[PDB]
Write a protein that binds this ligand. Structure first.
Ligand SMILES: *[C@@H](S)Nc1ccc(CCc2ccc(NCS)cc2S(=O)(=O)O)c(S(=O)(=O)O)c1
Ligand SMILES: O=S(=O)(O)c1cc(NCS)ccc1CCc1ccc(NCS)cc1S(=O)(=O)O
Lengths: 513, 514
C-alpha cells in the first residue's frame, strides 16, 4: 500500500526511494530495443510543438518578458533532472493552459498595482518550495486515496476533448486567413493543401496501426514496421510537401541562439529584492495566496496523471512514487522562478501517449479479444533523450524549418483519438446507442440494471458539462476547486441514490471487482 | 442442367421460356421493398456516366456521325426490351471499350476505301441477325460448359482492375490541365485540390456507411435502412458541400438538349439499306460477313461470361438464368437498331455485378468466424426497367444534372471497382501469397493442396493475365477475344500434365465445397 500514512516524518519519501532506487541499472539495460527509438522520435515532436505554441502565446500576453527560448530551456533542464532523479520516469512535464491563465492574471495584477512581475514571481516560488517541504515532511500525499475513478475519468475525457477541439480550430483558421476566392494573407492552394497533408498523415499512421495487427508478412518485420508508423507517415508527407514547388505552406520555426527574448529589459538572474526600484515588504508576505493556488493546480494535474498512468490494467511492476514526484517538481519550479523560467507540471495526454507507445501486446490465439497488455517496457532513457533533444533543438534550426505545421496536425489528431480508449466512461457512452441485447460481458453490465447505468453516465456527463462551462467563463481559475468538489459529491450525494452493490460494481478500484 | 443439348431445333429457347415465364407476376410484386429504390438511385448514375463519356469519344472518333444522343437512346430502348422480355433481368447492357475499338477500326477502313459508314453497318447488322438465328436454331450455346473458373476469374479481375485505372487517370489529368502554379477553362486555381477533396470525401463516407450497416448501433431496421442508402447519402452530402462553395470552378455533368441527331445536316433517323447518296457496291454486301463474325464473337464472350459470373451457386439465385433467351435478344436488337444508326450493345460486367450485389440480403449472424452468408438475392424486373427509363428521359431534365460535379462520381466509381473485387478466388489466392503459411484459412483448396503448388497455379494465372493485358495494350487489340478463348485449350491440355487430378479438382471446382 504505497498510499499509507506511516506516522513518521518523511516516511513516504524514504519508502519510495528504497522501493525504486535498487532497480537503477535495469532502466538503462532495458532501453536496448528498437521500439525505444520509435518512441523517442514520436514524442520529440509532441513535446517540441506545444513549447513553441505556448511560448509565442505567453510572449504575446506579457510584454515579451518570457518567450520561446526560456520555455524550451526550462522544459529541457526540468525534464533532464526529473528523468535522472525521478521515481516515475514515464511522465512528461511541460507548460499547459491553466498555468498560462494564471500567468496572464498575475501579469495583469502586477501591471495594475505598479509592481515588478519577474521579481514578484520569485517570492511565489519561495513559498511554493516552503509549502512542498511542509507537505512532504508532514506527509499528506495519502489524500490521493479519496480520488476514485469517477473523478479521474471526468478529468481525462475533458483534457482529451479540449485538445481535439483545438487541433481542429487551428485548421478552421488557415481557411479564414487564406480564404478560397481566385483571380502572407491571400495565397491560393494553401488551405486545401493543408487539409490534404493532414488527412494523409492521419490516414497513413492509423493503417500502419491496423497493419501492425494484421496477418501479413513475417511477425518480426510486421511488428518493426508497425512500431515506426508515425515516423514513416511524417517522412512520407514531408517528402510529398517538399516535392511541390510554388505553393506556400506555413512551416515550423524555432528561435536562433541561446539568449533571452528581451535582452534590453531583462537578464538571466533576477534579484530577489528590487531589480530597479525597491520591492514592497508587504507583497513578500502577501504572495502566499497565489503560491497556494499554483500549488493546488500543479498537485491536482500531477497526481491525477500519475493515478491514471499507474492503473493495474497497464502491467507496471517497478512501481510509482507519489512522494518523490511532487517535491521534485515543486522544488524545480521554485528554483527556476529565480532565473525567470516558467513553472512546469506533468502533461496528461503526452504522458499517456508515452506510456502506451511502449506497451507490448500478447501474441494471441484466433479466439482472443483485444489482446491483453503483456508488459510496458519502462526505462529512464527515452525521457532523458527527448528532453535533451528538445534542449538542443535550437542548434538544429534549419532541419526543422522544412516541416510544415499541417503535417503535425494529423499526428496530434492521432494522439487525441488514440488516448481515448482505456477509460470506462467512453465505453459507457458507447453503450448508450447500442440496443440492450448487444452489450458485452463486462462485470458492470451483468450485475447492474440497464436503466441505472445510463443514469450514472448521465450524471457524469452533467458534471463534465458543468466543468466545461465553468472553464469557458470569465472565472476559470476556480476549475481545480470545482474538480475537487466531485469527491464530496461521490462520498455523500451519490451514496443515497445508488445502493452499495451498484456503487461497488460501477466504479471499482480495479478490473473485475 | 440448363447447358444440355436436347437434340431438337430451338429446344433450349423453349426450355428457357417454359422455365422462366411462369414466374412473371412474382417479379413485379417482389419490387415493393425500400432497397429497390436505393438500387435504382445507385445504378442510375453508374449507367448514365459511361453513356456520356463513350458518346463523346465516339463522336470525336467518327466525325460526329454517332454522338451522345444516339448512345443515350440505344441504352434506353434496348434495355426496356430486355427487362420486359429477358430471361435474366439482373443484366445491365451498354457500350464498352472493345466495341469502340471495332467502331474506330471500321470507320478507318470505310474512309480508306471511299465507302459509306452508316450504310456499311446495316449489312453487318443483318449478318449478325442471321448468325444469331442460325446459332439459336442449332442450340450451339451449350459450348459454355467448357469455360471453367480459370477463364472466367481472369476476366473478372481484368475488368475491375481496368475500371480502377481509368478513375485514377481522370484525376491525374484534372491536375495536368489546372496545375498548382498560383497567381473548358484552363489554369484555374483551387480546382485540382477541391476535386481530390470531393472524391476522397465521397469514397470515405461510402465505406463508413457500408461498415455502419454491419455495426451494433441503433435499432436493426433503422440501421439497415440507413446502410442501404449509403451511396445516395454520400452523393447528396458532397453535392451540397460543393454547392456551398461559390467562387471555385469545378467541372459539372452535361447532357445534350433535345431529342435529335448530333449532325442534322449530314445524317437522318433512317438509313437506307442501299446507297444513301451513291450506290453501295454489291461485293461489300457479301464481304461484310467477317466483321459480323468478329463482333458476334465479342458480344457472345462478353455476355456469356457475365451471365456465368452472375449465376454462381454461391449467390442464392432460384428463379433461374437463360443462356439462350439472352443472345437472340442482345444480338438481334443490336443488329436491327443499326438501321436507324444506333450503336450495338452488350452486357456490362461491373455494372451487372454491382446491380446483382446491391440487392443481396445477408443472414442475421451469431458471433465472429465467417462473413455472414447470402440469404437471398431479391431478383425482379422493375429496377432495370426503371433505370433504363430514367436514362432515356434524362434529356428533358438536366438542369438538375448540371449541378453535379464529376469529381463526386469518381469516388462512387472507385467504390464500385473496389467492392466488385471480393467474391472471386483469384483475389483470395493473391492475398495468400503475402501471409505466412500458418495463417491460411480453413478453405477446401488449402487443406488438400500443398502450399508450393497453389502458388504455382496463382503464378501461371498471373502470367496469363499479364499476357492478356500486354496484348490488349499493343497495336493489335482486336485479337483479345481469341487470346481469351485460347485459355480453354490451355486448361484442357497443358495444365492437365503439370497437376494431378486431385489438385485440379480442388483448385478449379464448379462449386464451393468441392
Ligand atoms: C494547440 S497547442 N492549441 C492549444 C491552445 C490552447 C490549449 C489549452 C486550452 C485551455 C484549457 C484550459 C484552460 N483553463 C483551465 S483553468 C484554458 C485554455 S486556453 O484556451 O489556452 O487559454 C491547448 S491544449 O488543451 O493544451 O491542447 C492547445
Ligand atoms: O474499362 S472502362 O470501360 O471502365 C473505360 C473507362 C474509361 N474512362 C471512364 S468511362 C475509358 C476507357 C475505358 C475502356 C478501356 C479499354 C478496355 C479495353 C480495350 N480493348 C479491348 S479489345 C480498349 C479500351 S480504351 O477505351 O482505352 O480504348
Amino acid at each position: 500500500d504505497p498510499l499509507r500514512r506511516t506516522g513518521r516524518p518523511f516516511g513516504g519519501l524514504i519508502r519510495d526511494v528504497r522501493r525504486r532506487y535498487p532497480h537503477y541499472l535495469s532502466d538503462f539495460r532495458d532501453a536496448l530495443d528498437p521500439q525505444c527509438l520509435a518512441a523517442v522520435i514520436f514524442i520529440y515532436f509532441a513535446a517540441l510543438s506545444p513549447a513553441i505554441t505556448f511560448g509565442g502565446l505567453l510572449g504575446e500576453k506579457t510584454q515579451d518578458l518570457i518567450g520561446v527560448s526560456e520555455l524550451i530551456m526550462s522544459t529541457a533542464l526540468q525534464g533532464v533532472v526529473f528523468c535522472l532523479l525521478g521515481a516515475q520516469p514515464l511522465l512528461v512535464i511541460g507548460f499547459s493552459g491553466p498555468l498560462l491563465v494564471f500567468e496572464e492574471a498575475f501579469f495583469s495584477f502586477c501591471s495594475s498595482n505598479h509592481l515588478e512581475y519577474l521579481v514578484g514571481r520569485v517570492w511565489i516560488g519561495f513559498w511554493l518550495v516552503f509549502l512542498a517541504l511542509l507537505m512532504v515532511a508532514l506527509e499528506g500525499s495519502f489524500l490521493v486515496r479519496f480520488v476514485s475513478r469517477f473523478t479521474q475519468e471526468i478529468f481525462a475525457f475533458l483534457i482529451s476533448l479540449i485538445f481535439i477541439y483545438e487541433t481542429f480550430y487551428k485548421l478552421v483558421k488557415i481557411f479564414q486567413e487564406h480564404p478560397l476566392h481566385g483571380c502572407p494573407r491571400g495565397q491560393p492552394n494553401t488551405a486545401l493543401l493543408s487539409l490534404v497533408l493532414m488527412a494523409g498523415t492521419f490516414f497513413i499512421a492509423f493503417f500502419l496501426r491496423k497493419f501492425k495487427n494484421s496477418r501479413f508478412f513475417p511477425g518480426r518485420i510486421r511488428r518493426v514496421i508497425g512500431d515506426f508508423g508515425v515516423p514513416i507517415a511524417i517522412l512520407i508527407m514531408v517528402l510529398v510537401d517538399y516535392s511541390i514547388e510554388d505553393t506556400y505552406t506555413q512551416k515550423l520555426s524555432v528561435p536562433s541562439g541561446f539568449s533571452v527574448t528581451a535582452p534590453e529589459k531583462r537578464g538571466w538572474v533576477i534579484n530577489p529584492l528590487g531589480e530597479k526600484s525597491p520591492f514592497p515588504v508587504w507583497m513578500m508576505v502577501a504572495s502566499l495566496l497565489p503560491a497556494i493556488l499554483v500549488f493546488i493546480l500543479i498537485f491536482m494535474e500531477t497526481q491525477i496523471t500519475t493515478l491514471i498512468i499507474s492503473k493495474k490494467e497497464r502491467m507496471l511492476q517497478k512501481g510509482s512514487g507519489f512522494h518523490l514526484d511532487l517535491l521534485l517538481i515543486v522544488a524545480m519550479g521554485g528554483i527556476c522562478a529565480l532565473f525567470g523560467l516558467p513553472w512546469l507540471a506533468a502533461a496528461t495526454v503526452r504522458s499517456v501517449t508515452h506510456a502506451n507507445a511502449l506497451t507490448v501486446m500478447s501474441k494471441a490465439v484466433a479466439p482472443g479479444d483485444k489482446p491483453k497488455i503483456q508488459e510496458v517496457k519502462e526505462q529512464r532513457v527515452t525521457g532523458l533523450l527527448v528532453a535533451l533533444l528538445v534542449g538542443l533543438s535550437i542548434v538544429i534550426g534549419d532541419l526543422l524549418r522544412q516541416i510544415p505545421l499541417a503535417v503535425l496536425f494529423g499526428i496530434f489528431l492521432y494522439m487525441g483519438v488514440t488516448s481515448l480508449n482505456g477509460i470506462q466512461f467512453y465505453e459507457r457512452l458507447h453503450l448508450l446507442l447500442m440496443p440492450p441485447k448487444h452489450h458485452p460481458d463486462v462485470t458492470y453490465v451483468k450485475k447492474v440494471r440497464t436503466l441505472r447505468m445510463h443514469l450514472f453516465t448521465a450524471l457524469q456527463l452533467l458534471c463534465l458539462a458543468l466543468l466545461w462551462a465553468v472553464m469557458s467563463t470569465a472565472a476559470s481559475l476556480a476549475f481545480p476547486f470545482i474538480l475537487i468538489l466531485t469527491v464530496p459529491l461521490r462520498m455523500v450525494v451519490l451514496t443515497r441514490i445508488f445502493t452499495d452493490r451498484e456503487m461497488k460494481c460501477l466504479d471499482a478500484n480495479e478490473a473485475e471487482p
